[PDB]
Amino acid sequence: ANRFTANIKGLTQASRNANDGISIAQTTEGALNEINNNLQRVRELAVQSANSTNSQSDLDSIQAEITQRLNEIDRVSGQTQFNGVKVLAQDNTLTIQVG
């Protein structure tokens, strides 16, 4: 009975930890999706830049939005964090106990 109860309690807490892992993955995923949208916009602007009819002022104008998008990308990367873990700031490996 003691062994079975220990296993039961541990496995319940393991389920909770699995839920936590799901949550962290989901948060990272949302941030990544938004970043991807910004990247799409950047590609669009880049394609616009190629037009040889544009004047240098026009190119500067396009560069303005390009810089703004890149700044936002970096800001999201720096700031997004879950439970005090900046999940996109520095390479890392996390381990979720389930056994």
Binding site: L11, A14, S15, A18, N19, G21, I22, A25, Q26, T28, E29, L32, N33, I35, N36, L39, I96, V98
Partner: peptide, 22 residues
């Protein structure tokens, strides 16, 4: 970016399967 997203999706599926087994 898409490669990373795919990795996350795989891990989430694994999490769900583990939860049901538990």
């Amino acid at each position: 970016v898409d490669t990373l997203r795919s990795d996350l999706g795989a891990v989430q599926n694994r999490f769900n399967s583990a939860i049901t087994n538990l």
